[PDB]
């Protein structure tokens, strides 16, 4: 599937989040090589270092099911620009990811920044 | 369901964990109202600090796919006495679950705990 | 030093606070064994996930110093009656003190609640 | 100051690191605007989440005592070449700090990198 399609599934993802502090909801998609889409959304807690991003559900769900291998994923909130992951989700993706797999930062007026998760973290 | 039928399932979610660092896999199967069970596992990192516990992979999981309420969770680990869960991840069940919700902590040898969300966390 | 000392500390402490998202100021004081008190106050970041509390701050600044003896830690926010800590804050203070050292918490209003580190996570 | 004094700082602080688990010490160094230094370790945890990186501690313990100026951070491990902070770290460095805030990453044998806070994390 294309990046297009990706990204309405995490425009659908978003939809689930969890947010009454924040009121800020954030939708991933992750696309495995065998052409699998887990969506994932952010989760907070009153308790705000307990917070968990969309990337990270989604990513967590994947390895949860046995699913490894990952060639893309998009991201979605309702920013002016697409703004990209937080730090702490950018180490967890090149964790699980490799340093060529795509990330399409989207939001939800059709703009699209393409990078990758090594051009996220230089020297990771 | 009972309460032997949610410590095998969450003995199943266990073989999925991504623990290269540690070495110790952890599983959680969380019980929604309505009967349905999600599975989760501990997902580790490089950096020690971004760690995911089994826990909160479950809940997260179910949030994302819509699911609110929850009945019952077990958590399995290969100890000597069955281990309580983290205070982070007794700090996201408060939040996510009710103070009465059932928690049967076990390990793979016969022991077995049943306490519950409200007991775990005092004062929370 | 008493416990009415080392609120007063705590009161000190929280004043220092980085909170513009939550605007929610708490402060802790740390006492070793030998009577130096350590300050801390929470952190927070735009993204939540990576805020600090107060206790975490007074704790990493004692073990910097190569103060590893804790005897007592206060703690203090605006609430009605006094709110313990969150749970992953439990959790760093069973790695770093004993079972036994006091934990005061406090308001601003004079009421107090002593517990200890131990009763604070039943069973870690 | 200068770069090698900084560096020489971290060194110093990495020696007080609480590192059981990994037993993988590093040191960071903060300088303020004035002039004053900061030091600070990782702090580890048995729940591996909970961590505490060298170049927060650092930081926190400058807010902590009211510094919020910075004009550059150093930080030292024993890796084959210097490297970066974790995606983490680079968040709150971020927050913190100037996006023109001086990094110098080393090693104990020689290696050095200078960076900055806004290099390290694109887009943020
Ligand atoms: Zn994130
Ligand atoms: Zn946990
Ligand atoms: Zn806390
Ligand atoms: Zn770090």
């Given at each position: 599937?294309?990046?297009?399609?990706?990204?309405?599934?995490?425009?659908?993802?978003?939809?689930?989040?969890?947010?009454?502090?924040?009121?800020?909801?954030?939708?991933?998609?992750?696309?495995?090589?065998?052409?699998?889409?887990?969506?994932?959304?952010?989760?907070?807690?009153?308790?705000?270092?307990?917070?968990?991003?969309?990337?990270?559900?989604?990513?967590?769900?994947?390895?949860?099911?046995?699913?490894?291998?990952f060639?893309?994923?998009?991201?979605?909130?309702?920013?002016?620009?697409?703004?990209?992951?937080?730090?702490?989700?950018?180490?967890?993706?090149?964790?699980?990811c490799?340093?060529?797999t795509?990330?399409?930062?989207?939001?939800?007026?059709?703009?699209?920044?393409?990078?990758?998760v090594?051009?996220?973290?230089?020297?990771?």
């Amino acid at each position: 599937m294309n990046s297009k399609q990706l990204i309405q599934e995490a425009i659908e993802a978003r939809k689930q989040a969890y947010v009454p502090y924040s009121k800020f909801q954030v939708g991933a998609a992750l696309l495995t090589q065998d052409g699998k889409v887990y969506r994932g959304c952010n989760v907070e807690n009153a308790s705000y270092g307990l917070c968990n991003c969309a990337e990270r559900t989604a990513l967590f769900k994947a390895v949860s099911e046995g699913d490894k291998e990952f060639v893309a994923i998009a991201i979605v909130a309702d920013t002016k620009r697409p703004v990209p992951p937080c730090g702490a989700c950018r180490q967890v993706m090149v964790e699980l990811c490799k340093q060529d797999t795509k990330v399409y930062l989207s939001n939800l007026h059709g703009d699209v920044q393409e990078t990758t998760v090594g051009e996220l973290l230089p020297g990771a």
